[PDB]
Amino acid sequence: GSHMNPPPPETSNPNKPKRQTNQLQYLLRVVLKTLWKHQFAWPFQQPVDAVKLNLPDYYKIIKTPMDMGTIKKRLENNYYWNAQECIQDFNTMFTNCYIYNKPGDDIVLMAEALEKLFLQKINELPTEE
Ligand SMILES: CC(=O)N[C@@H](C(=O)NCC#CBr)C(C)C
């Protein structure tokens, strides 16, 4: 894409140790699955294309971008060591939306609906075995 968008977050790095855990399997098969298919998922399914959206200040404000397309690839490609790393990515994605946009805004209402579902699912994250 455009030279004016940053490179997306890392989804592959052989030097980073990786593990499958039951919690990570739940984050893919239950959490990501549930949120990905939601009516309001679409703005979150790929990195923000600030050029196409005409938001030249986006990556001036948001220095820790994250999106569910990146999280999906991280889960599918077993990038994580533990569930906390993945939960942090989700939280970063929501917080970026809340920081950049105004409380009224459609995108915020959408993020808040996804976050409510996320919280319900994470309260049932299974005990690590
Ligand atoms: C969710 C987030 O981080 N911010 C959104 C944003 O840049 N503004 C939405 C509007 C306008 Br004009 C992005 C996901 C599209």
Q: Spell out the domain ranges in the chain.
A: 22-124
Contact (CB, 8 A) for 82 and 21: yes
Task: Calculate how far, in angstroms, residue 55's C-alpha sits from the geometric centre of ligand 1.
Answer: 8
Resolution of this entry, Å: 1.1
Class of 22-124 in CATH? mainly alpha
**Structure obtained using:** X-ray
Mutating to test ligand 1, I would choose from 45, 48, 60, 106 the residue with most ligand atoms within 8 A of its C-beta, which is 48
Residues 6+ apart with CB under 8 A from 36: 45, 68, 72
- The neighbour count for residue 98, using CB atoms within 10 Å, is 15
Task: Calculate how far, in angstroms, residue 45's C-alpha sits from the geometric centre of ligand 1.
Answer: 12
**Half-sphere exposure in the Cβ direction for 87 (13 Å, CA):** 13
Give the span between the Cα atoms of 23 and 27, in whole angstroms: 6
Secondary element (H or E) of residue 119: helix 106-123
Secondary element (H or E) of residue 123: helix 106-123
